[PDB]
Structure formats: structure tokens, C-alpha cells
């Protein structure tokens, strides 16, 4: 699934 | 079938320290996103931030100077400390998690009332 | 900082009738294909409970009668027909752009 990093959603 | 519960006072004096408590049952926190949201009496809602299933947070700039979210995941809880509170601070304070779903706060508390005042 | 514009701030609707409500984004909300846009229907005493999330997929225990479509800045909720159950303030909100926020609500009356 997506990753979320500081409020948005990435692969990696 | 995962539960969230929030608990934690009632009453913060102005300036102090305010913290609560999400009592997770039924799933473990070391997966998912968990939450915190507040909603204002006059009814806004405002998204507070998250600690994440690898420990990682994520705050709302509007606070995150005085905002620390936390987790033992042996209690499978996880925590809200807001500090310096003024009475703008005064709200009703959720848990939710957000799973990989949905990418949606799906599951709620029932929320907590948090007043400030002297 | 990014906004979310509900529009109307309320509507009165008869039961069995349409209610539709509008959810603008001041800038696009998607990311890898998805529109990170979710509604939320609140009543008082009661958290908010998810209807749709990313635009346009119905929880599960919400019925067909709520659906939701758009994407990247322009989304709208609709139920129909309306039951007197639906008596509620709806949000919508967006979880990719910080910081994370929700629209203001629109309050859905039923005619009776």
C-alpha cells in the first residue's frame, strides 16, 4: 500500500 | 471490529498540560494510522495528527509547535499531549484510524469532552 | 493553506427526494490515481461516522443510497432518496495536501 509522509500518501 | 476509547480529564487549567489517552481493543497498533481529531463547539472539525504503525508522526502545522503524539504499543494505547492550553483549546478529542483500505478515518471513539478554563 | 468549500451551508429535503451537497478543494487533492477526499455524516453526541471514501467508494454499512463522484478539486456527495435517519451535518476531507483539513459542514434538515 501507500506510505504517508508529512500529510501525503507515496510508494516509497 | 477494532475499538478506539479516549480517555483522560475533563478539566485543563490554562497553560497546563493537556493529555489523553486512546484505548485500542481488537487489532494492533503496529499496523494503521492512529489519530487525533477535535471538534469545536462551535462545530469545526481540525485534524490534530498521527502517529503511524513505525512510529512516525505526522502533526497539523497549526500545532505542531505544542503537540506530541505518542504510543506503547505494549498497552496497545497511544497518546495526545497538547501543551500550553488556552481556552481555545476547548473541544470534543477523537481516536480514529486511518487503515490502507480505505486511506479514510474509519474507525472512531465516541470522543471526549476537554474543556480549559481557570 | 489548502481549503475544502461546502456549499450550501444547509437544505431542507422531503423524504424520498434527492440531496445533493458540493465539496471544492482550493487545490487538487489526488495523488497515484486516487482523490483523497472522504465524507463523513456527524450527528450530535456521535463522532463521524466514514460514508464514502476516495471520492467515489461506499463504506461498508453505509447504503446505496449515498454515493459521491468527482475528482482532483470538485467533488459532490448525494443521497437518495432521503430518509429521516439522514438528519445530519456532512463533512468532507482531505488527507493528501498538508495540512490535512475538512470543509466547514452543511446541515441536511428532512421536511416532514
Known amino acids: 500500500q501507500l506510505i504517508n509522509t508529512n500529510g501525503s500518501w507515496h510508494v516509497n | 471490529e477494532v475499538q478506539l476509547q479516549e480517555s483522560g480529564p475533563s478539566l485543563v487549567k490554562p497553560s497546563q498540560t493537556l493529555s489523553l489517552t486512546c484505548s485500542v481493543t481488537?487489532?494492533?497498533?503496529?499496523?494503521?494510522?492512529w489519530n487525533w481529531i477535535r471538534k469545536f463547539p462551535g462545530n469545526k472539525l481540525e485534524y490534530m495528527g498521527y502517529?503511524?504503525?513505525?512510529?512516525?508522526?505526522y502533526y497539523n502545522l497549526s500545532l505542531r509547535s505544542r503537540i506530541s503524539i505518542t504510543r506503547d504499543t505494549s498497552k496497545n494505547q497511544y497518546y495526545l499531549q497538547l501543551n500550553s492550553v488556552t481556552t481555545e483549546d476547548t473541544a470534543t478529542y477523537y481516536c480514529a484510524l486511518i487503515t490502507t483500505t480505505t486511506y479514510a478515518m474509519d474507525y472512531w471513539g465516541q470522543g471526549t469532552s476537554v474543556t480549559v478554563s481557570s | 493553506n489548502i481549503v475544502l468549500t461546502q456549499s450550501p451551508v444547509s437544505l431542507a429535503v422531503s423524504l424520498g427526494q434527492r440531496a445533493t451537497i458540493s465539496c471544492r478543494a482550493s487545490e487538487s487533492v489526488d495523488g497515484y490515481g486516487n482523490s483523497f477526499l472522504h465524507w463523513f455524516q456527524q450527528k450530535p453526541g456521535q463522532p463521524p461516522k466514514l460514508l464514502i471514501y476516495?471520492?467515489?467508494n461506499l463504506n461498508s454499512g453505509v447504503p446505496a443510497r449515498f454515493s459521491g463522484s468527482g475528482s482532483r478539486t470538485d467533488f459532490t456527495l448525494t443521497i437518495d432518496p432521503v430518509e429521516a435517519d439522514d438528519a445530519a451535518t456532512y463533512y468532507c476531507?482531505?488527507?493528501?495536501?498538508?495540512?490535512?483539513?475538512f470543509g466547514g459542514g452543511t446541515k441536511l434538515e428532512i421536511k416532514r
Open positions: 476516495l471520492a467515489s
Open positions: 481488537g487489532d494492533s497498533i503496529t499496523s494503521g494510522y
Open positions: 502517529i503511524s504503525y513505525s512510529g512516525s508522526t
Open positions: 476531507q482531505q488527507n493528501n495536501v498538508d495540512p490535512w483539513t
